[PDB]
Amino acid sequence: SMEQVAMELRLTELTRLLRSVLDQLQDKDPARIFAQPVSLKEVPDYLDHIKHPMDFATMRKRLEAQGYKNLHEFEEDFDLIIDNCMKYNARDTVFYRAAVRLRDQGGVVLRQARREVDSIGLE
Ligand code: NA
Numbered sequence: 001s002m003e004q005v006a007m008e009l010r011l012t013e014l015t016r017l018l019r020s021v022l023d024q025l026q027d028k029d030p031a032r033i034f035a036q037p038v039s040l041k042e043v044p045d046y047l048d049h050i051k052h053p054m055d056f057a058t059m060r061k062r063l064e065a066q067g068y069k070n071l072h073e074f075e076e077d078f079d080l081i082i083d084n085c086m087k088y089n090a091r092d093t094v095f096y097r098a099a100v101r102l103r104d105q106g107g108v109v110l111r112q113a114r115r116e117v118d119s120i121g122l123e
Pocket of ligand 1: 087
């Protein structure tokens with residue numbers, strides 16, 4: 001149908017916007033602490049602590065499959081990256097501190113992203 005095509009165009013445009021958002025968020029992690037999944041070889045007990053692991057590479061996979069239907073779903077995954085890190089790691093670690101900085105700097109980006117999604121009407 002023409003409607004389904006229109007819906008798919010909207011999703012494709014959302015995916016384009018979120019790809020820009022993802023790139024901006026990841027630029028706020030130049031240490032690449034959050035770039036890849038935590039290794040279960042190097043941290044074998046990780047899943048005892050963290051029930052829903054997340055990282056930028058896993059987000060990018062979902063994004064390119066157009067698996068984010070709205071900005072809320074994308075934000076949920078970003079918050080998982082931050083929140084998982086701040087539970088597993090103590091306050092005095094480079095990991096926890098990187099997550100705080102990413103959260104703070106990311107908030108700016110996500111604030112305007114919400115406005116753009118609402119304005120352009122992409123969801
Ligand atoms: Na903790």
